[PDB]
Amino acid sequence: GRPFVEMYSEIPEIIHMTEGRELVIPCRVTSPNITVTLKKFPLDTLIPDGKRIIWDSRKGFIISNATYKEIGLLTCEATVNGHLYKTNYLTHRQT
Ligand code: NA
């Protein structure tokens, strides 16, 4: 039920992307104070800069201009009360 509004575990949510276009990783959370980390598999953290990558607790991560670097398995992580919670997204190019 928390911290992610919609959690995808073993079966990731598939998201279609296009290079040069906005990509939203929709791991919105149930309250705005939850710190969420974005990792690209295997172990590649994407830090939001408020520019090319924005965090919005009500929307998820917004990537204004998606690149080849965002193709693949993306995971949002949040830690609550000593527990690590994960939700998974698999991107691939529209065509
Ligand atoms: Na989600």
Numbering used by the authors: 132 to 226
Question: What does the original paper state about this entry?
Answer:
Three receptor types have been highlighted: VEGFR3 (also called Flt-4) regulates lymphangiogenesis, VEGFR2 (KDR/Flk-1) is the primary proangiogenic receptor, whereas VEGFR1 (Flt-1) has been proposed as a regulator of VEGFR2. In this study, we showed the presence of a metal site at the dimer interface of X-ray structures of human VEGFR1 domain 2 (hVEGFR1d2) solved in the presence of different divalent metal ions. The three structures are similar and reveal a homodimer with interlocked hydrophobic surfaces buried at the interface and a divalent cation chelated by four histidine residues (two from each monomer). Importantly, the dimer interface involves residues that lie in the core of the hVEGFR1d2 surface that interacts with VEGF-A, VEGF-B or PlGF.
The Cu2+ had a tetrahedral coordination similarly to Zn2+. Three additional Cu2+ ions were also bound to the His214 and to the N-terminal main-chain of an adjacent molecule in the crystal packing. The metal ion coordination site is octahedral for Co2+ and tetrahedral for Zn2+ and Cu2+. However, the analysis of non-redundant structures shows that the coordination of Cu2+ by three or four His residues is highly frequent and that such coordination is scarce for Co2+ and Zn2+. The mean estimation for ΔG dissociation was 12.7 kcal.mol-1, 58.1 kcal.mol-1 and 18.4 kcal.mol-1 for (hVEGFR1d2)2-Co2+, -Zn2+, and -Cu2+ respectively. Because the competition assay results indicated a higher effect of Cu2+ ions compared to Zn2+ or Co2, the Cu2+-induced dimerization of hVEGFR1d2 in solution was verified using analytical gel-filtration chromatography. In the presence of 1 mM CuSO4, two peaks were eluted corresponding respectively to the hVEGFR1d2 dimer (78% of absorption, apparent MW = 27.9 kDa) and monomer (apparent MW = 15.8 kDa). Copper (CuSO4) and palladium (Pd(OAc)2) demonstrated the lowest IC50 values (0.97 and 0.36 μM, respectively). To confirm the specific interaction of Cu2+ with hVEGFR1, the competition assay was performed in the presence of a metal chelator (EDTA, 1 eq.). Under these conditions, Cu2+ was unable to disrupt the VEGF-A/hVEGFR1-ECD interaction.
